[PDB]
Amino acid sequence: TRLPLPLRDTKLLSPLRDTPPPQSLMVKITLDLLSRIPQPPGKPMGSDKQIKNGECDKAYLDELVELHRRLMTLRERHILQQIVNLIEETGHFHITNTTFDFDLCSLDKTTVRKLQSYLETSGTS
Numbered sequence: 001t002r003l004p005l006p007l008r009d010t011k012l013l014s015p016l017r018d019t020p021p022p023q024s025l026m027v028k029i030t031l032d033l034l035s036r037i038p039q040p041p042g043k044p045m046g047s048d049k050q051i052k053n054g055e056c057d058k059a060y061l062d063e064l065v066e067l068h069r070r071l072m073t074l075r076e077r078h079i080l081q082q083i084v085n086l087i088e089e090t091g092h093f094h095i096t097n098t099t100f101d102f103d104l105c106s107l108d109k110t111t112v113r114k115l116q117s118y119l120e121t122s123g124t125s
Contacts, residue, residue, distance in 0.1 A: 027068050028101035029080060036081055038088050038095060055105070064105055064112070070119060079118060086111070 031037070055061075074080075084100070087093050090111075093102030104112050 024105075025065055025068050026101045026103065027071055028099055029071075029083075031096065031098050031100055033075070033077070034080055034084075034100070035077070036084060037097070037100075038084055040095065041091070067104065067112070067116060067119075074119075082118065083115065086114070 084093075087102055087107065090107060092106050094100065104115070
């Protein structure tokens, strides 16, 4: 009677998928305070190549991580349009009528440099 296993946190999760995507940090901007909602895609379109990258453990991640944050503390509008459209031109973002995110660690490193830039119009330091 609950002698061996008192009580676990979470039982069996969804159908154990085969080597499913990893886990890290993603950027999600409330769909409410967005206003603009990019139109959905046309044809399914789904590659299969997926080049095996090698982020490896380093430190540069710190930057990307911090970014996601400073992004959450954004409330000036007008810019969101420059963050959604910019990527729009290049798929790789999940859209939803109630949420929308994307991965900045996937697209070229240039896209990240641009974003960070605007995210600092004033003049930190």
